[PDB]
Amino acid sequence: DPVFMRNVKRVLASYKESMDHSSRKGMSREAFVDINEKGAAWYLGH
């Protein structure tokens, strides 16, 4: 094992899901969620 390719293969085998695209979610969190001093919260309204 001259070069750490086992870790490369391990991290490449885990490509089943992408964080940019959702398969069964009609609503998005990046459009309503924002963190405040108390935590995360959904802000509904323009």
Partner: protein
């Protein structure tokens, strides 16, 4: 105008009762010695209703003094003792920052609204269940429950004088719905009936109503519970609703148990909500954000997502004016039928919901067993 009343604790109310000299002391002489308190008060105040007298006596605004150095609070059935005093507040006692019960002051009706023949006909048509104490109507989509900011719009509060079939006073709405929500609405015919049914619409632990909804997309779970914490803030021309997973002092919880009855593969779902709280747009918010499935036609929460192109063969996604697919289906009542079961009133599905159900091949009129009778 009641604009001078202030929040008072029991200590402050007792202190104001002690300070204010706007009191009348009826001396119990030999002629009234031995009578009942309610009888004495009914004979001495002909302008007061028995409900008003009962509220005053039971809340303690009217009391008696037996020359002991302390005030004596009694029941309506207690007898009067000789040479004692009966302390009753006067009219000027309620002009300070202490609000009286509802029967003390006198309200004025003033104007009386006029309903046309067609309005009365449709009001009679919307009736689902009638009883000696309650009337359940089928409010449709797009009809406001109360007069909005524009006074020129019709409303159920304005159609209310049409459901006094034989009574003298119009009924009183027990719970309000959104402008887009359509379904069963409860109207108490008696004042006592309203006071007793108000307990049924506060936050509870066991649900007694159903909401049938058609949501865009199928959630990852078939059944479960939804719990959010809503904070309402005043905006420019609306209300900013902040939904949180953790409670705050200025927030209020919204809880509902949802069950996905039937659904398309991953494009649409039919969900039954059973709420335990009463929060603004509760079902719509919990569907759009907790279940991540916006209700079909819910343009306020997930506007572009509420008009999917998957149903373009049935609903044109370009008008964006189709009714909200959320219907107050079934509600249980404390009154029992002849068979011994609680009366459960059910409202038929609206036109758009029945059309969607028929296009997807689902039966429209099915009894929901999760709310027993």
């Amino acid at each position: 105008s009641h604009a001078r009343y202030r929040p008072l604790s029991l200590r402050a109310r007792q202190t104001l009762s002690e300070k204010s000299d706007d009191l009348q002391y009826h001396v119990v002489t030999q002629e009234w010695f031995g009578e009942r308190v309610d009888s004495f008060l009914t004979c001495h105040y002909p302008q007061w209703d028995y409900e008003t007298i009962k509220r005053l006596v039971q809340q303690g605004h009217i009391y008696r003094y037996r020359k002991n150095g302390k005030k004596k609070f009694t029941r309506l059935t207690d007898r009067l003792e000789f040479d004692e005093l009966l302390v009753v507040p006067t009219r000027a006692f309620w002009e300070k920052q202490l609000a009286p019960p509802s029967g003390v002051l006198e309200e004025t009706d003033g104007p009386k609204f006029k309903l046309s023949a067609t309005a009365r006909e449709m009001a009679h048509n919307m009736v689902l269940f009638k009883n000696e104490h309650v009337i359940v109507i089928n409010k449709p989509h797009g009809l406001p429950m109360m007069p909005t900011d524009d006074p020129q719009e019709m409303s159920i509060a304005a159609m209310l004088p049409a459901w006094k079939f034989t009574n003298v006073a119009k009924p009183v709405v027990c719970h309000n719905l959104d402008r887009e929500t359509s379904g069963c609405v409860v109207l108490a015919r008696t004042r006592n009936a309203h006071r007793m049914l108000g307990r049924m619409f506060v936050k509870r632990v066991v649900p007694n109503s159903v909401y049938w909804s058609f949501c865009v997309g199928k959630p990852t779970v078939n059944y479960g519970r939804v719990r959010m914490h809503f904070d309402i803030t005043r905006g420019n021309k609306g209300d900013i609703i902040v939904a949180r997973p953790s409670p705050t002092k200025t927030s209020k919880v919204a809880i509902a148990e949802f069950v996905v009855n039937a659904s398309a593969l991953e494009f649409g779902s039919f969900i039954s909500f059973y709420p335990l709280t009463t929060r603004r747009h509760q079902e719509r918010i919990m569907a759009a954000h907790a279940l991540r499935c916006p209700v079909l036609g819910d343009a306020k929460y997930g506007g572009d997502a509420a008009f999917p192109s998957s149903l373009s063969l049935f609903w044109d996604p370009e008008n964006k004016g189709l009714p909200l697919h959320l219907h107050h289906r079934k509600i249980q009542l404390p009154y029992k039928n002849t068979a011994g079961e609680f009366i459960c009133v059910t409202a038929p599905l609206p036109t758009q919901m029945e059309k969607t159900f028929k296009k997807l091949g689902w039966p429209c009129e099915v009894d929901d067993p999760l709310i027993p009778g």
